[PDB]
PDB file of all heavy atoms in Angstrom:
ATOM      1  N   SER A   1       0.861  -1.183   0.004  1.00  0.00           N
ATOM      2  CA  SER A   1      -0.004  -0.008   0.003  1.00  0.00           C
ATOM      3  C   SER A   1       0.864   1.244   0.000  1.00  0.00           C
ATOM      4  O   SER A   1       1.954   1.212   0.634  1.00  0.00           O
ATOM      5  CB  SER A   1      -0.946   0.068   1.204  1.00  0.00           C
ATOM      6  OG  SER A   1      -0.418   0.834   2.266  1.00  0.00           O
ATOM      7  N   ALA A   2       0.437   2.283  -0.733  1.00  0.00           N
ATOM      8  CA  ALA A   2       1.242   3.499  -0.851  1.00  0.00           C
ATOM      9  C   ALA A   2       1.638   4.110   0.475  1.00  0.00           C
ATOM     10  O   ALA A   2       2.730   4.688   0.615  1.00  0.00           O
ATOM     11  CB  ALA A   2       0.552   4.517  -1.665  1.00  0.00           C
ATOM     12  N   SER A   3       0.794   4.024   1.475  1.00  0.00           N
ATOM     13  CA  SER A   3       1.042   4.752   2.714  1.00  0.00           C
ATOM     14  C   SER A   3       1.979   4.020   3.690  1.00  0.00           C
ATOM     15  O   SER A   3       2.627   4.637   4.551  1.00  0.00           O
ATOM     16  CB  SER A   3      -0.280   5.095   3.430  1.00  0.00           C
ATOM     17  OG  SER A   3      -1.339   4.331   2.943  1.00  0.00           O
ATOM     18  N   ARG A   4       2.082   2.683   3.594  1.00  0.00           N
ATOM     19  CA  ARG A   4       2.946   1.896   4.451  1.00  0.00           C
ATOM     20  C   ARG A   4       4.193   1.390   3.772  1.00  0.00           C
ATOM     21  O   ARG A   4       5.245   1.352   4.421  1.00  0.00           O
ATOM     22  CB  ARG A   4       2.173   0.662   4.956  1.00  0.00           C
ATOM     23  CG  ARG A   4       1.140   0.906   6.021  1.00  0.00           C
ATOM     24  CD  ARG A   4       0.682  -0.408   6.620  1.00  0.00           C
ATOM     25  NE  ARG A   4      -0.151  -1.153   5.687  1.00  0.00           N
ATOM     26  CZ  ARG A   4       0.346  -1.953   4.704  1.00  0.00           C
ATOM     27  NH1 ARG A   4       1.560  -2.351   4.671  1.00  0.00           N
ATOM     28  NH2 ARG A   4      -0.528  -2.273   3.686  1.00  0.00           N
ATOM     29  N   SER A   5       4.153   1.080   2.497  1.00  0.00           N
ATOM     30  CA  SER A   5       5.176   0.258   1.863  1.00  0.00           C
ATOM     31  C   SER A   5       6.229   1.107   1.201  1.00  0.00           C
ATOM     32  O   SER A   5       6.062   2.329   0.958  1.00  0.00           O
ATOM     33  CB  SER A   5       4.517  -0.665   0.841  1.00  0.00           C
ATOM     34  OG  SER A   5       3.538  -1.537   1.476  1.00  0.00           O
ATOM     35  N   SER A   6       7.380   0.466   0.859  1.00  0.00           N
ATOM     36  CA  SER A   6       8.452   1.176   0.131  1.00  0.00           C
ATOM     37  C   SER A   6       9.196   0.126  -0.634  1.00  0.00           C
ATOM     38  O   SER A   6       9.135  -1.057  -0.359  1.00  0.00           O
ATOM     39  CB  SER A   6       9.333   1.946   1.104  1.00  0.00           C
ATOM     40  OG  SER A   6      10.019   1.074   2.008  1.00  0.00           O
ATOM     41  N   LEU A   7      10.063   0.605  -1.571  1.00  0.00           N
ATOM     42  CA  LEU A   7      10.945  -0.294  -2.296  1.00  0.00           C
ATOM     43  C   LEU A   7      11.941  -0.916  -1.328  1.00  0.00           C
ATOM     44  O   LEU A   7      12.227  -2.109  -1.356  1.00  0.00           O
ATOM     45  CB  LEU A   7      11.713   0.450  -3.380  1.00  0.00           C
ATOM     46  CG  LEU A   7      10.971   0.734  -4.702  1.00  0.00           C
ATOM     47  CD1 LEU A   7      11.426   2.065  -5.215  1.00  0.00           C
ATOM     48  CD2 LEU A   7      11.230  -0.359  -5.747  1.00  0.00           C
ATOM     49  N   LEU A   8      12.395  -0.114  -0.402  1.00  0.00           N
ATOM     50  CA  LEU A   8      13.256  -0.619   0.712  1.00  0.00           C
ATOM     51  C   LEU A   8      12.647  -1.812   1.376  1.00  0.00           C
ATOM     52  O   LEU A   8      13.238  -2.884   1.530  1.00  0.00           O
ATOM     53  CB  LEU A   8      13.559   0.493   1.657  1.00  0.00           C
ATOM     54  CG  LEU A   8      14.230   0.174   3.005  1.00  0.00           C
ATOM     55  CD1 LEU A   8      15.649  -0.453   2.818  1.00  0.00           C
ATOM     56  CD2 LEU A   8      14.212   1.378   3.874  1.00  0.00           C
ATOM     57  N   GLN A   9      11.415  -1.636   1.866  1.00  0.00           N
ATOM     58  CA  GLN A   9      10.722  -2.701   2.574  1.00  0.00           C
ATOM     59  C   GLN A   9      10.538  -3.939   1.669  1.00  0.00           C
ATOM     60  O   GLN A   9      10.590  -5.066   2.170  1.00  0.00           O
ATOM     61  CB  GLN A   9       9.388  -2.237   3.076  1.00  0.00           C
ATOM     62  CG  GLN A   9       8.810  -3.109   4.169  1.00  0.00           C
ATOM     63  CD  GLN A   9       7.277  -3.061   4.225  1.00  0.00           C
ATOM     64  OE1 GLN A   9       6.652  -2.321   3.451  1.00  0.00           O
ATOM     65  NE2 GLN A   9       6.681  -3.866   5.110  1.00  0.00           N
ATOM     66  N   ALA A  10      10.283  -3.728   0.373  1.00  0.00           N
ATOM     67  CA  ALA A  10      10.239  -4.852  -0.532  1.00  0.00           C
ATOM     68  C   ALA A  10      11.553  -5.586  -0.574  1.00  0.00           C
ATOM     69  O   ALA A  10      11.620  -6.821  -0.531  1.00  0.00           O
ATOM     70  CB  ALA A  10       9.853  -4.374  -1.915  1.00  0.00           C
ATOM     71  N   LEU A  11      12.697  -4.857  -0.674  1.00  0.00           N
ATOM     72  CA  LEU A  11      13.984  -5.513  -0.818  1.00  0.00           C
ATOM     73  C   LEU A  11      14.369  -6.250   0.459  1.00  0.00           C
ATOM     74  O   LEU A  11      14.888  -7.398   0.372  1.00  0.00           O
ATOM     75  CB  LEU A  11      15.027  -4.473  -1.208  1.00  0.00           C
ATOM     76  CG  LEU A  11      14.852  -3.953  -2.658  1.00  0.00           C
ATOM     77  CD1 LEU A  11      15.580  -2.621  -2.786  1.00  0.00           C
ATOM     78  CD2 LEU A  11      15.289  -4.942  -3.674  1.00  0.00           C
ATOM     79  N   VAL A  12      14.164  -5.642   1.639  1.00  0.00           N
ATOM     80  CA  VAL A  12      14.496  -6.412   2.860  1.00  0.00           C
ATOM     81  C   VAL A  12      13.561  -7.576   3.047  1.00  0.00           C
ATOM     82  O   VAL A  12      13.902  -8.570   3.700  1.00  0.00           O
ATOM     83  CB  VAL A  12      14.548  -5.525   4.135  1.00  0.00           C
ATOM     84  CG1 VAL A  12      15.588  -4.395   3.909  1.00  0.00           C
ATOM     85  CG2 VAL A  12      13.214  -5.011   4.507  1.00  0.00           C
ATOM     86  N   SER A  13      12.317  -7.511   2.518  1.00  0.00           N
ATOM     87  CA  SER A  13      11.474  -8.696   2.606  1.00  0.00           C
ATOM     88  C   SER A  13      11.975  -9.848   1.793  1.00  0.00           C
ATOM     89  O   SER A  13      11.839 -11.026   2.173  1.00  0.00           O
ATOM     90  CB  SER A  13      10.023  -8.374   2.174  1.00  0.00           C
ATOM     91  OG  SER A  13       9.454  -7.281   2.938  1.00  0.00           O
ATOM     92  N   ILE A  14      12.572  -9.550   0.619  1.00  0.00           N
ATOM     93  CA  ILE A  14      13.149 -10.617  -0.190  1.00  0.00           C
ATOM     94  C   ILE A  14      14.337 -11.192   0.590  1.00  0.00           C
ATOM     95  O   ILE A  14      14.471 -12.439   0.740  1.00  0.00           O
ATOM     96  CB  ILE A  14      13.540 -10.082  -1.566  1.00  0.00           C
ATOM     97  CG1 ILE A  14      12.269  -9.717  -2.359  1.00  0.00           C
ATOM     98  CG2 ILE A  14      14.367 -11.131  -2.337  1.00  0.00           C
ATOM     99  CD1 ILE A  14      12.514  -8.853  -3.594  1.00  0.00           C
ATOM    100  N   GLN A  15      15.241 -10.350   1.071  1.00  0.00           N
ATOM    101  CA  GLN A  15      16.388 -10.887   1.772  1.00  0.00           C
ATOM    102  C   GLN A  15      15.963 -11.601   3.048  1.00  0.00           C
ATOM    103  O   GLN A  15      16.418 -12.738   3.284  1.00  0.00           O
ATOM    104  CB  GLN A  15      17.371  -9.768   2.090  1.00  0.00           C
ATOM    105  CG  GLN A  15      18.739 -10.357   2.430  1.00  0.00           C
ATOM    106  CD  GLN A  15      19.537  -9.396   3.186  1.00  0.00           C
ATOM    107  OE1 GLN A  15      20.145  -8.509   2.613  1.00  0.00           O
ATOM    108  NE2 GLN A  15      19.755  -9.679   4.472  1.00  0.00           N
ATOM    109  N   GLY A  16      15.019 -11.052   3.765  1.00  0.00           N
ATOM    110  CA  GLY A  16      14.683 -11.590   5.082  1.00  0.00           C
ATOM    111  C   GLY A  16      13.709 -12.766   5.053  1.00  0.00           C
ATOM    112  O   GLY A  16      13.746 -13.666   5.957  1.00  0.00           O
ATOM    113  N   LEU A  17      12.853 -12.796   4.064  1.00  0.00           N
ATOM    114  CA  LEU A  17      11.754 -13.840   4.063  1.00  0.00           C
ATOM    115  C   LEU A  17      11.942 -14.847   2.925  1.00  0.00           C
ATOM    116  O   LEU A  17      11.311 -15.894   2.976  1.00  0.00           O
ATOM    117  CB  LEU A  17      10.392 -13.194   3.906  1.00  0.00           C
ATOM    118  CG  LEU A  17       9.861 -12.306   5.082  1.00  0.00           C
ATOM    119  CD1 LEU A  17       8.599 -11.579   4.594  1.00  0.00           C
ATOM    120  CD2 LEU A  17       9.552 -13.096   6.294  1.00  0.00           C
ATOM    121  N   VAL A  18      12.702 -14.524   1.907  1.00  0.00           N
ATOM    122  CA  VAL A  18      12.897 -15.435   0.772  1.00  0.00           C
ATOM    123  C   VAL A  18      14.254 -16.167   0.853  1.00  0.00           C
ATOM    124  O   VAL A  18      14.272 -17.405   0.776  1.00  0.00           O
ATOM    125  CB  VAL A  18      12.726 -14.686  -0.549  1.00  0.00           C
ATOM    126  CG1 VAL A  18      13.026 -15.613  -1.743  1.00  0.00           C
ATOM    127  CG2 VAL A  18      11.360 -14.065  -0.635  1.00  0.00           C
ATOM    128  N   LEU A  19      15.348 -15.434   0.979  1.00  0.00           N
ATOM    129  CA  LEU A  19      16.668 -16.016   1.024  1.00  0.00           C
ATOM    130  C   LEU A  19      17.032 -16.465   2.413  1.00  0.00           C
ATOM    131  O   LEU A  19      17.941 -15.958   3.100  1.00  0.00           O
ATOM    132  CB  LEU A  19      17.703 -15.027   0.477  1.00  0.00           C
ATOM    133  CG  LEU A  19      17.385 -14.457  -0.948  1.00  0.00           C
ATOM    134  CD1 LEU A  19      18.478 -13.559  -1.400  1.00  0.00           C
ATOM    135  CD2 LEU A  19      17.147 -15.579  -1.995  1.00  0.00           C
ATOM    136  N   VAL A  20      16.278 -17.495   2.859  1.00  0.00           N
ATOM    137  CA  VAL A  20      16.315 -17.993   4.237  1.00  0.00           C
ATOM    138  C   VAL A  20      17.102 -19.248   4.365  1.00  0.00           C
ATOM    139  O   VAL A  20      17.599 -19.805   3.346  1.00  0.00           O
ATOM    140  CB  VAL A  20      14.902 -18.177   4.783  1.00  0.00           C
ATOM    141  CG1 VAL A  20      14.095 -16.839   4.801  1.00  0.00           C
ATOM    142  CG2 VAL A  20      14.142 -19.232   3.961  1.00  0.00           C
ATOM    143  N   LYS A  21      17.205 -19.820   5.581  1.00  0.00           N
ATOM    144  CA  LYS A  21      18.036 -21.005   5.817  1.00  0.00           C
ATOM    145  C   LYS A  21      17.455 -22.220   5.214  1.00  0.00           C
ATOM    146  O   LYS A  21      18.152 -23.038   4.625  1.00  0.00           O
ATOM    147  CB  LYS A  21      18.269 -21.162   7.328  1.00  0.00           C
ATOM    148  CG  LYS A  21      19.233 -22.283   7.675  1.00  0.00           C
ATOM    149  CD  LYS A  21      18.896 -22.920   9.007  1.00  0.00           C
ATOM    150  CE  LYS A  21      20.134 -23.373   9.714  1.00  0.00           C
ATOM    151  NZ  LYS A  21      19.861 -24.153  10.976  1.00  0.00           N
ATOM    152  N   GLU A  22      16.110 -22.407   5.357  1.00  0.00           N
ATOM    153  CA  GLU A  22      15.392 -23.595   4.881  1.00  0.00           C
ATOM    154  C   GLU A  22      14.283 -23.173   3.925  1.00  0.00           C
ATOM    155  O   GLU A  22      13.097 -23.233   4.284  1.00  0.00           O
ATOM    156  CB  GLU A  22      14.859 -24.404   6.091  1.00  0.00           C
ATOM    157  CG  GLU A  22      15.970 -24.964   6.909  1.00  0.00           C
ATOM    158  CD  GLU A  22      15.466 -25.890   8.002  1.00  0.00           C
ATOM    159  OE1 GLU A  22      15.307 -27.107   7.732  1.00  0.00           O
ATOM    160  OE2 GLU A  22      15.160 -25.383   9.106  1.00  0.00           O
ATOM    161  N   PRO A  23      14.662 -22.795   2.697  1.00  0.00           N
ATOM    162  CA  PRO A  23      13.640 -22.254   1.778  1.00  0.00           C
ATOM    163  C   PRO A  23      12.574 -23.219   1.311  1.00  0.00           C
ATOM    164  O   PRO A  23      11.520 -22.765   0.831  1.00  0.00           O
ATOM    165  CB  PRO A  23      14.501 -21.768   0.602  1.00  0.00           C
ATOM    166  CG  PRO A  23      15.734 -22.604   0.685  1.00  0.00           C
ATOM    167  CD  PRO A  23      16.035 -22.753   2.131  1.00  0.00           C
ATOM    168  N   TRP A  24      12.798 -24.534   1.448  1.00  0.00           N
ATOM    169  CA  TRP A  24      11.743 -25.477   1.079  1.00  0.00           C
ATOM    170  C   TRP A  24      10.424 -25.201   1.735  1.00  0.00           C
ATOM    171  O   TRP A  24       9.375 -25.452   1.159  1.00  0.00           O
ATOM    172  CB  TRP A  24      12.238 -26.901   1.406  1.00  0.00           C
ATOM    173  CG  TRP A  24      11.344 -27.978   0.788  1.00  0.00           C
ATOM    174  CD1 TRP A  24      11.178 -28.280  -0.521  1.00  0.00           C
ATOM    175  CD2 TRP A  24      10.518 -28.892   1.517  1.00  0.00           C
ATOM    176  NE1 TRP A  24      10.277 -29.327  -0.668  1.00  0.00           N
ATOM    177  CE2 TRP A  24       9.855 -29.718   0.595  1.00  0.00           C
ATOM    178  CE3 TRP A  24      10.267 -29.086   2.902  1.00  0.00           C
ATOM    179  CZ2 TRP A  24       8.991 -30.735   0.988  1.00  0.00           C
ATOM    180  CZ3 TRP A  24       9.377 -30.095   3.266  1.00  0.00           C
ATOM    181  CH2 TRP A  24       8.761 -30.877   2.305  1.00  0.00           C
ATOM    182  N   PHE A  25      10.446 -24.699   2.963  1.00  0.00           N
ATOM    183  CA  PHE A  25       9.273 -24.352   3.699  1.00  0.00           C
ATOM    184  C   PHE A  25       8.641 -22.997   3.274  1.00  0.00           C
ATOM    185  O   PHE A  25       7.595 -22.595   3.770  1.00  0.00           O
ATOM    186  CB  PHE A  25       9.523 -24.328   5.218  1.00  0.00           C
ATOM    187  CG  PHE A  25      10.032 -25.608   5.726  1.00  0.00           C
ATOM    188  CD1 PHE A  25      11.364 -25.753   6.122  1.00  0.00           C
ATOM    189  CD2 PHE A  25       9.174 -26.722   5.906  1.00  0.00           C
ATOM    190  CE1 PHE A  25      11.836 -27.004   6.610  1.00  0.00           C
ATOM    191  CE2 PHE A  25       9.624 -27.923   6.343  1.00  0.00           C
ATOM    192  CZ  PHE A  25      10.999 -28.088   6.681  1.00  0.00           C
ATOM    193  N   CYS A  26       9.272 -22.259   2.325  1.00  0.00           N
ATOM    194  CA  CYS A  26       8.624 -21.136   1.740  1.00  0.00           C
ATOM    195  C   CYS A  26       7.369 -21.509   0.982  1.00  0.00           C
ATOM    196  O   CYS A  26       6.549 -20.638   0.678  1.00  0.00           O
ATOM    197  CB  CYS A  26       9.598 -20.415   0.795  1.00  0.00           C
ATOM    198  SG  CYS A  26      11.001 -19.600   1.580  1.00  0.00           S
ATOM    199  N   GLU A  27       7.286 -22.790   0.587  1.00  0.00           N
ATOM    200  CA  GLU A  27       6.032 -23.375   0.048  1.00  0.00           C
ATOM    201  C   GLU A  27       5.018 -23.517   1.160  1.00  0.00           C
ATOM    202  O   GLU A  27       5.264 -24.292   2.083  1.00  0.00           O
ATOM    203  CB  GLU A  27       6.348 -24.664  -0.625  1.00  0.00           C
ATOM    204  CG  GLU A  27       5.162 -25.306  -1.318  1.00  0.00           C
ATOM    205  CD  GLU A  27       4.597 -24.504  -2.439  1.00  0.00           C
ATOM    206  OE1 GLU A  27       5.387 -24.062  -3.366  1.00  0.00           O
ATOM    207  OE2 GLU A  27       3.407 -24.219  -2.461  1.00  0.00           O
ATOM    208  N   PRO A  28       3.857 -22.855   1.112  1.00  0.00           N
ATOM    209  CA  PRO A  28       2.930 -22.898   2.245  1.00  0.00           C
ATOM    210  C   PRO A  28       2.481 -24.300   2.642  1.00  0.00           C
ATOM    211  O   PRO A  28       2.299 -24.577   3.836  1.00  0.00           O
ATOM    212  CB  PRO A  28       1.727 -22.059   1.762  1.00  0.00           C
ATOM    213  CG  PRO A  28       2.304 -21.161   0.670  1.00  0.00           C
ATOM    214  CD  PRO A  28       3.390 -22.010   0.045  1.00  0.00           C
TER     215      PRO A  28
END
């Protein structure tokens, strides 16, 4: 959303939530 989100927050979400220790569990 425009009022909360930013490109920065997008990029740290990729590093923090995608490039994780056990990515197989990224599949819900």
Side-chain angles (χ1 to χ4, degrees):
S1 97
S3 16
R4 284 192 290 81
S5 303
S6 64
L7 281 144
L8 167 65
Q9 199 207 357
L11 290 161
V12 304
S13 303
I14 294 164
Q15 199 200 281
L17 295 168
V18 176
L19 305 183
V20 298
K21 183 210 214 188
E22 294 186 89
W24 190 69
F25 301 107
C26 294
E27 184 62 53

